[PDB]
Amino acid sequence: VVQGTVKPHASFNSREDAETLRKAMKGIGTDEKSITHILATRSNAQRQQIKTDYTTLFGKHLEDELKSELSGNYEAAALALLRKPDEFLAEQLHAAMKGLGTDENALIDILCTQSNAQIHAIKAAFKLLYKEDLEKEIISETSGNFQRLLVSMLQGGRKEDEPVNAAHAAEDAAAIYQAGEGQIGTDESRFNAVLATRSYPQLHQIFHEYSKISNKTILQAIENEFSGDIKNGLLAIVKSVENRFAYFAERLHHAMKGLGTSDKTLIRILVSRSEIDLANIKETFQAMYGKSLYEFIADDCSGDYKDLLLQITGH
Amino acid sequence: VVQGTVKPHASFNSREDAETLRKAMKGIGTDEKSITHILATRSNAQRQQIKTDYTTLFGKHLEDELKSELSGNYEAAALALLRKPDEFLAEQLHAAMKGLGTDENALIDILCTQSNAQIHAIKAAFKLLYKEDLEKEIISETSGNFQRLLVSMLQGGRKEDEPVNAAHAAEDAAAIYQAGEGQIGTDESRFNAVLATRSYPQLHQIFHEYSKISNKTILQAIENEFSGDIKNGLLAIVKSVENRFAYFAERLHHAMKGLGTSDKTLIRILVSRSEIDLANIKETFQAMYGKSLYEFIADDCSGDYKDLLLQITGH
Amino acid sequence: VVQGTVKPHASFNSREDAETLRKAMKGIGTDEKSITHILATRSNAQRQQIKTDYTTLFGKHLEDELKSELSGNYEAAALALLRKPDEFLAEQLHAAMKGLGTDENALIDILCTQSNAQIHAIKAAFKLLYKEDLEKEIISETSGNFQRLLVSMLQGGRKEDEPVNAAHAAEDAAAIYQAGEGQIGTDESRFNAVLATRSYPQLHQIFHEYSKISNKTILQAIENEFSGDIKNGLLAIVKSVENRFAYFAERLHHAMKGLGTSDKTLIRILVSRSEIDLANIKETFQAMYGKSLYEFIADDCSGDYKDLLLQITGH
Amino acid sequence: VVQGTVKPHASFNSREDAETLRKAMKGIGTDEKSITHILATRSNAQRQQIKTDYTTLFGKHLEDELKSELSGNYEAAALALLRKPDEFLAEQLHAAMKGLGTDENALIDILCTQSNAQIHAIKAAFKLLYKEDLEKEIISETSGNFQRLLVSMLQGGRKEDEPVNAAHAAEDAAAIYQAGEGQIGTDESRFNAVLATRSYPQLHQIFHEYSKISNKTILQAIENEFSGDIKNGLLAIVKSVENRFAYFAERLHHAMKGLGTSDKTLIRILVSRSEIDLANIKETFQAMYGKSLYEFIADDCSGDYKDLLLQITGH
Amino acid sequence: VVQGTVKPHASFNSREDAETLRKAMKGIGTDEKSITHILATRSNAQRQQIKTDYTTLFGKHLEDELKSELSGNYEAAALALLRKPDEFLAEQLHAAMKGLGTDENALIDILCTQSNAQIHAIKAAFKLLYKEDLEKEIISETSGNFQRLLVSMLQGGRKEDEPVNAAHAAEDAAAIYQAGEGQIGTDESRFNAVLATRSYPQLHQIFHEYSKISNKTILQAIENEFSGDIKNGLLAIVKSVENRFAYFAERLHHAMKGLGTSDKTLIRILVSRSEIDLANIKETFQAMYGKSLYEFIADDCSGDYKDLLLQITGH
Amino acid sequence: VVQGTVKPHASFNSREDAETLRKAMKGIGTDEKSITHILATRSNAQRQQIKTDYTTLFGKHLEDELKSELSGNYEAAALALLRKPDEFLAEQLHAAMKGLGTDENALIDILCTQSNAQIHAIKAAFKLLYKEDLEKEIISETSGNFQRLLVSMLQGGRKEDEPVNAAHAAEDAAAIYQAGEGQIGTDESRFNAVLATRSYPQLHQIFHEYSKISNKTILQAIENEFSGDIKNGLLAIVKSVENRFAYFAERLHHAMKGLGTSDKTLIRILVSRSEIDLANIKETFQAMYGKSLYEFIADDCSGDYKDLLLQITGH
Numbered sequence A, B, C, D, E, F: 001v002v003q004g005t006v007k008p009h010a011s012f013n014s015r016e017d018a019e020t021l022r023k024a025m026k027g028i029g030t031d032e033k034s035i036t037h038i039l040a041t042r043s044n045a046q047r048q049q050i051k052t053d054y055t056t057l058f059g060k061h062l063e064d065e066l067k068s069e070l071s072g073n074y075e076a077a078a079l080a081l082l083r084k085p086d087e088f089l090a091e092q093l094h095a096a097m098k099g100l101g102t103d104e105n106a107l108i109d110i111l112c113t114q115s116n117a118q119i120h121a122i123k124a125a126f127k128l129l130y131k132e133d134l135e136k137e138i139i140s141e142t143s144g145n146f147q148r149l150l151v152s153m154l155q156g157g158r159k160e161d162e163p164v165n166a167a168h169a170a171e172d173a174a175a176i177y178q179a180g181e182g183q184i185g186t187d188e189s190r191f192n193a194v195l196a197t198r199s200y201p202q203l204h205q206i207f208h209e210y211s212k213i214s215n216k217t218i219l220q221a222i223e224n225e226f227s228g229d230i231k232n233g234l235l236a237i238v239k240s241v242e243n244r245f246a247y248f249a250e251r252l253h254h255a256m257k258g259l260g261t262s263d264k265t266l267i268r269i270l271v272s273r274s275e276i277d278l279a280n281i282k283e284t285f286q287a288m289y290g291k292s293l294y295e296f297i298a299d300d301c302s303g304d305y306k307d308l309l310l311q312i313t314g315h
Ligand SMILES: [Ca+2]
Pocket: A025, A026, A027, A028, A029, A030, A069
């Protein structure tokens, strides 16, 4: 079964939890252990009900309160947990795009791994938060082959109900072959077109047909025929169709690798997947990497930052 | 029974009414007695149907036609009567905030005396008429304890289905006591939090428990522990819980007291409550004040302004 | 039966059609015969499915690809066929109003010949496309009696469910008579008022009553009492009530008259009536004018423009 | 000499005056006598320097502080006195137009009595404050002959350097005569045209030429040929050309007449002419009305409101 | 000498002219002969003074009055002549871009034949009229090589003070040769780079160096190496450097060729060059075409449209 | 002397540098060594000249070209170097406030260390880039004492021309003493008010008077009477007045401390002070820290990022 690590607190009362957070912040200092405990043990919908009771009881929004009480990564991870899911991704896209430079990788994690219905919700929430239109913003901040793949992803046009038909999986696998390996350059239109429109079941069957004609896997073929941003965008889709839990277990491992941490990725994957398949992502992490995801966080992170994260994650 | 003073015209024809109003304004002069009569004897829903036939028969809006034929308080009262009810309060709020100064008292009349579903409607009609967000605009034009009470009010978060439970009514009455009378200062958070979230039946029970532990009523305690705008904000909620008809009979009485009139209060309350509980507000007014509301208006107001008001109100 | 000239392609595949249009523009040149054929033999809803698949396969919009491959009227007509129908009218309006001058005649064709629900959709699509409000925009770009008829039109307030009542048809016929013929001036309010509010069935009955009291038809009386823009605005309503097909067969004939063509009218009527009643407009054209519609276009137009138009029209 | 009643404080220090206001609001209560004293004995440019130092010393704007400490008419007058002069009128216009109704009379006081240069500054300050265009807003909120008079005033196109030429003063006086008195109706275009473009010296000479061809004055001729808003509009210009001080002495007298006060007018004229010609408006008031301006305000107004107003006006 | 065909009316009075136009439109009908006369015999700056007096005398804008009195091409030409010159061109770009399709040719006439300082003004007038940014809009409505040449044009970065240096003219001519003729493809960056940055004196020198190394002129080389929009974009710059008057005499000739007229071009070139170099364009027309520009218009055009146009042009 | 580490390239040609950057990116790969070289050895105004020529030569902006060729921290440091100086800071503010959380420290680095003139430019560049108002944005994203210190900073109201007057330096040092050390609480208004308004020379004199009355330095008293955000806000002003170069040397040292780097601080301070006083900040770094700033970067950083940063810094 695919499930996340956060489950709704049983015998929840938003009034009482709003009043416990007010008490945790009252006076000088803050009781972070209380804040961490409430946020990390209520589901996102319960956190949204705590938030309406806090503003009705107190006249101030819980968000504004935390930004004055908290700092740095604990503030960011806490604040992430109160964002309605769709909005959080909508906001993470914004951050990737409108800074100095681009988090190319944040855009791939969010647009390339998504269903049609999720793309339609991330597009809506961005419009609502930012008044601008995301495809118009993606087209302003990206160019070339990469831009084109993210414009495809924003349409929500995959033929998700297309059935596995092996004669066609074979026609497409051959088509991709001629585009890549079968010629000197690469016709990128054919990579983008097939990986953007075919259902995920039908894409699986293509990948298998491709290994019977070629002596490289489709991953190897993209890895050789493509460079940079579009190479990582197209491999994200291949990894999503083959095994989504491994894609994120990978992206998480890389956040924690070497010196320091890429907390931005860490907060983003842990928080977004927490109520969808963070349980599965954890078993795939362990199997691929030796250590547990818990152990990994426990070593790379510190303070309350580390605690909040380790209570979302669980052992 | 709680009822207003304006009941829908039986055998109403908006085409014929639209035609009458054009005839009452044609030429030099205006036939005010005819405008007064159609506007005051039609319910607001009928006046909205008159409004659509006027613009489709004559290609100009009835409002624009009135602003030319009328002046001063008769124009203001006549135009008040044509506004959709939600829009009229959203518009009164705009006028209280975005002038020279603040009509602190219009903002309390509209936000502190409302149910969750009416707050939600006044908020939406505002965003529609003004493109801005009311909670954002109240936060720009107010400060401190009063701003927080109006931010609580705009959430629509009262637990209106909360049942009378005496043990709790008793625990909150005790908590309000310590926050006020039982200490030198005043913890205002406690006052704001209890009056803003409990249901009105549970609040009634609290006020009763408070008098058994204090020798003062909750109104006296507020009157003493608080000043200015928040003192008035908080007593509007207590007065709405105990007797809403008396709150408004009071506010009307003060509009008409002394020299001149506060027509802005007078038009706003008469017109908003005309199809809700103006009958009951009229009986409480006489009971509290000696004179009838009819008689009060007849003395303080003049011309056609006086007649339009006296026809909405009735004897 | 009333029916247009374009019927949905049976065994339609949007993925394959998108692919064929990419193949038709690939390289230097364009294969216009291929574009003409896909556009002219798919219904507008099928063209919208081809659009979503083109953008998901290729990551560029079919519109942007045609603007670069095509030019002049073939670009205009091809692009007109791809617009969602409501949008295409909201766009036409924009073009009439906001240039050097006014295409007075576009505004009448679109606003004066429409049902309540169609007026409400054109109004919506305009607000969506252009963020401004259409009635605010028609009031900025028109004045006087004309402005007033087009504001009436924009209210969607015709009493479409008004039943044929001869006694009343007779009272209004007589009212229009006094306003016009029965007096030196013209009371325009009465011509506007009756033509804007009465159902089309009840209007038919009035035109009949009018010929029994007058020796002139309502057309001749409008033709004489009125000038210019409003004279053409009021005759568009009468012609729509008596015979809509003839209104357009007329408009079309005039587009193709003399030296050159008014392609802007030609593309607009052909394309908006193609799936509603272009077949009926074509019979009425022949009947009124001797030659066929097909024959007329075939003579006044050229290139691929002419072929596209001839395929949408049929023989 | 023409001069106002408010002169710059000699040995002014904005830092000290900012600190004195902070001390007058500190704590419970407010020391209104101290706020009245600084605001009323500092010229408007000194008040703006007090405003910058308050916000740099305490990090809150002075305005926000006074809205919390003050109420009603004292809040409104104290806040009027802190507005930059051009912004105060741009705001007074906004208030006259976008409420329930129109203060027809505020609009004429501001737009009909002004020079080209002032109109151009009220226009600019409005667009700044409100992002909208004043002419576009006057055209939305007014109709007909009055709207045209107000659009004329907003152009800033009076030929102010036009010299007195009696042959033409005579030609125009005659033209005005034929437009009005010399015919049954009124050609308003001629009244509008000559009163809006000719210089004020040349206009004076015209009024004189008129009385030699008519037995009525131009005032009487306007008074009879015109009604309502445009009659008051055109009389404002005539009284501004003949005697501007008397125009305001009149409007002030009427603000204070009868029961109550029209404080809105009262604050508006006293505060806007305080540094221009409130000295002269005061002599003309006494001379026309018997009592002093000071004496009038002292009877019609109360509290601290009356004190502020009595310090701006002087004896 | 380079000069236009409209010269400022000597003994011009804007008040008297504004009055003459009101008289021309008063009543039923319009006196087009009078409007044609004032418009065509006043310079553009005088027309802007007539425009302010008309609005200050009558309270309505001249433009709005002409849209109600006029129709079709006379309305368009008479309104073109009242537009401030910069605005006219910003408005023409808007009309080329934001309709159904693109007038690719309007964009090249305006952007590819301009100085740095004129581009800078057309950019400014667009942002002013439209609130949007012209480069942003040109990037939305165009793609590819063409887009890139128009984004170059909009920078205003031509090195206008660069001096004729034959060694470099020779070096660039050589560079263009290799880009084009000297290879199978075309490196377009090299054509775009040299024709967009070098001064017009230097460019002339290059064209001359080019003919000594090639056997084709740079025109023939562009004509062969390029296609469509970019081919005409690049040839507009070469024809502006060699002879601007011939570029427009050609554009004008094609507006009038065949059946009908392209009035849109005809009004646009005649009105924009009328005070710059229409007299030169007229001598080049005759020289190149046989007939006079006057005689051409006289045959292709009609009504008052034809007259207005023949007055602007002269014999 | 106070000077930065980047000096204008002598014999600079923007056309040739723009061509060099095109060649460095052409094809697959990028020649980062060339890009680093031009960006790091041209002053910012020279970089703006390169930018205009790149877009006029190639029709695409240099920023868009780098985002596609670069990645990570080299992208951000390269793009940082191309921003107009005022825009860069206005962009840094935006990134500090509008993400998940607040970079409290970037806001103090920027707003608390600036002159009046600099604050006024950051305010303008923000409004321009972001259409919003910075003060309004700081007031949205910050609360309490901190917000008030940053609102004071945004006023540009420091009396920079205030002269050192020992009697007053002593009066204020004693006021700060009673506000802090001389009482249990802290009156923060007094710390805010003296630090925000007095000139930097007068402030130095105050700090000296304070140590004669107290036994602790003003830094120790702030360190003890204050907490968090406002403690760091007030200490940045005290460090700015005493020694600006040490404030930054301190901030840089902390960016590079421990595991990882805070690149965002590193790029921000290196880039902003490069042409102002990076030479002095480097001497103060060595003196305070043992190692050179060069040596520090060279250890904490890698790749091309490290090279770019080491070339802007110098040895
Ligand atoms: Ca705390």
